[PDB]
Amino acid sequence: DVQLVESGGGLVQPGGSRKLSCSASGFAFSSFGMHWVRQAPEKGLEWVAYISSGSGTIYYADTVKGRFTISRDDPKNTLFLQMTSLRSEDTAMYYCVRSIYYYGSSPFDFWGQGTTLTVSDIVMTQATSSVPVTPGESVSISCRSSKSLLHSNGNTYLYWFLQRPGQSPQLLIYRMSNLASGVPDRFSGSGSGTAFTLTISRLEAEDVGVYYCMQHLEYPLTFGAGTKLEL
């Protein structure tokens, strides 16, 4: 099965250096682009870096550019993240995310379990922080963007993720309407221009969690604050 295991995290001194590794098994690693996404404790998701398939294209977030270096070893199916000058702002759980890009592909489909590091731009808005829900009732989640995510090619590069408590985020809706593989049909993504809605018909216990909307129109990739579902 598809697996992404992170290692190398731990408590480090401020200003130090640490090397994070992401070992991939069960899929063609060299065919997938790879992202690092971190999540500060009791905070939302934050994109860190991206390396393309073939290592030809590399992108960094502004808050980490110049200090972090991302690299991959295709024969060993290992993804690396070399970090330097680590600050207290870098204390987060770092997730290894695979993403392949072709017509009709589903980027960000699989996330790793993550490794914990402790140190001693389109704006995506999710105003509703929490929503009280009951099973069997329809729920709608709203997302907003500072810029229109609808491109001239007809795609609207909006993504929906679900992070259940204790679990890594999982892709639900990619490009604002398509349903990810392995996701029940009750989830539906609807949007237009800058306003987007995620409708969850017949809510169940498994659906409880935090929902993030991400834009992929341009780099750096930015996440919404997140909407939490509670019973």
Place this chain on the structure above:
Amino acid sequence: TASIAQARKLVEQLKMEANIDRIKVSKAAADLMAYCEAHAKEDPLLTPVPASENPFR
């Protein structure tokens, strides 16, 4: 007895084809002409679309 067995099968097949109902060629021609006329407007190759509606600009 391979040839005699094949002959029976070939004769039996020709019986099925000879018992079908055939409409007039004029009736068949009209249906083909009607279908082309009815769907003429929605044929981009017959009537090229404006460049704004052409995915292959």
Place this chain on the structure above:
Amino acid sequence: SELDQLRQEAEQLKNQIRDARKACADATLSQITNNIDPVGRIQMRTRRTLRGHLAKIYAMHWGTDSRLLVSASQDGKLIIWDSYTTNKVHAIPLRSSWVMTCAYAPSGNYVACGGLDNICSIYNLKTREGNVRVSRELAGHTGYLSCCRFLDDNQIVTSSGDTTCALWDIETGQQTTTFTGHTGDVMSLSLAPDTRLFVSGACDASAKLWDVREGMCRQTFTGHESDINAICFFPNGNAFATGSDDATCRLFDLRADQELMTYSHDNIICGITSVSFSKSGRLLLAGYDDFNCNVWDALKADRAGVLAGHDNRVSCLGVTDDGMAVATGSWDSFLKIWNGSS
């Protein structure tokens, strides 16, 4: 004695069918469509050129989204193209490089191909591993695979050079139905829009209409003088057109059970490789050995235009489901996308 008597009855039955067809040949399609105005001159430009194949392209098939297409070449490579951007979506290395046909599943999840290896290989395009893998190898034909078409994700029809067509269950790998009756190599097949019937053209210069569920030949269409290389159903399913090596295209009617129109020109002396209809069926596009593609008026048998953009044989062509564009593949290793402009 018995053999001589039986073969005489076949000749009597053939005369009975010929008289029956002549009885219903009250008028000609040319007379019916004389009054209608011509389509004019059809001008199509090469919008896209698909480069990357390093050998003769032998087959292509559009996906149902009218944007993705799969092409087969004898460099041992199956390529899936994004026609809007000319991006290569996939490159499938073939175990046998002598591929002659390829098909795109209507769902878009599978592609099929096969050639002189006598095998129809099914490739899964949607895997969790991110690569295309062989899902099935359909063995059972004793000749080369000439054409294949999906009915759904589990059923596919193949025509072979062993004079037979077969219907396959992909999940079990067994041919549920075998279609026999052609005396020559079957070179092509076309599915009816409702996928209840399909026509096949063989090298016995005859076209047979087969029932998929029942598994027998319903009607036989003759009139060509040489091997049939191409066949295509009319968009409404009540007719089909064939292309042969005698430089002619003929329009046969299912219900009238006879030929309705011939599409030939005195300058054309080369064989025909591929035929297709426009979305409304008013245009018949045919690929030729003389490096050109001639667009015919289906109703009036007039050459509406010429697609001249290849330096070698036009081996295959196909029109999208929405009718927006036509793709032509050629032995010069290039694919071209054509449509007109206002």
Place this chain on the structure above:
Amino acid sequence: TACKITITVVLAVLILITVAGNVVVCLAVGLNRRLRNLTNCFIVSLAITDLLLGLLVLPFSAIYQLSCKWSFGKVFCNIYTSLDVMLCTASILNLFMISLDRYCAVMDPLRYPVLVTPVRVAISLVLIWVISITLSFLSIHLGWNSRTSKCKVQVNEVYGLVDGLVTFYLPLLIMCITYYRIFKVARDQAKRIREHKATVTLAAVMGAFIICWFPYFTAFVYRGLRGDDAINEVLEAIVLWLGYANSALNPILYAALNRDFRTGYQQL
């Protein structure tokens, strides 16, 4: 006055043919996709070089010969002479590389794709221009060829031998040897299987090269050794324009005598 007009027409036709002839070769490879092969790489380089000669050197040479005075600046004359030396030396060395290209095609036809790999074509093209630039710009600007209305190329005893032998006489010796071995192989095949088909084509290719360039380099070496006044003024003009006339025949000998190019013209 009538002779001046007559000579002007002759020069105008020669310039027009050279420019128009090499445009067709450039367009034939440009328009035809099948002609964009490594076998025609040298012919394109030859056609490009001769087109520049017909635009940057020939129009100015015609003015200088007709008016018998160099109205342009003295500094520009040095660049004009350097361009004339660079383009003509490259054009001569282009023909030398074509003979070597054909020599491997005929003598060792099985191993031709590995002995004429496109890496070696790129290196040879670079070395042609490096030698062409060195003998044209560096030699003139540094006074290597040094002994106001005259803008003729200056030459000394040492420079005449170096330029004459390396640019023309050494390639001529090899090309005669190379094209003679090819002639033996072509004749042998015909005897086993027109009998003079290889004779006419090879004589026309070698005949034009020798006719157009041998008298010039013979006079060029003689002029350097015996001074600039040894060569008659009328004679010096004849041999100078024979070398220019070669660029009008290269589109005919190496393109119009090719199977693909003749059919390529029909596609245009």
Place this chain on the structure above:
Amino acid sequence: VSAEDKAAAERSKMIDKNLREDGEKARRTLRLLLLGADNSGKSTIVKQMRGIFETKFQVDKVNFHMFDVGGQRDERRKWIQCFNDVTAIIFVVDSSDYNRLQEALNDFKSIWNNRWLRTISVILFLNKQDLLAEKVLAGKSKIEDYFPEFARYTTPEDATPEPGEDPRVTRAKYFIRKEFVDISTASGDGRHICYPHFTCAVDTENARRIFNDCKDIILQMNLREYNLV
């Protein structure tokens, strides 16, 4: 273009990089098509040198790839179009069996006069010469029975028989060869040339004869484009 389109375009460019790398290795090999009958013994020729059966052998740093299509029926007029770009066709016949020689001659005529084989030379092999020599020496079966023109055929003076060969063998062996060459010279207008040869089941020079003949086939193409022939 969007951020995903740029990544898709980069994926497309990586595919083209691997297409050229895989496609570059196939340009250095020469493609050969092996044809014949069941009794032709073409399997012995390839085995000695060594749906589709392939064989790769090297002769002086030159790679040959010979394809034998043994999974198809007799009607090859359709799938022969696939082998339109092969350098040579290695047609093998059995000389000993005079009964099927006319079938081989009829078979060779279809291949030579094929519409899609107008520029493909044929490296003709007449296999099993030792069996033919014994058959002629015995005299039980005479070629005149099947070929009436053999009785009126005389050995040309230009012929150069191998040492230790009876004159009777040379007259019969060259008559069979003349039948095939007469078909070759009848048509083609010099576009392609047949290269007849005589081999046996124990001959080990089959690879070299193909090497020399393939050199002539390629050489004629180079001379043709240079207008030297």
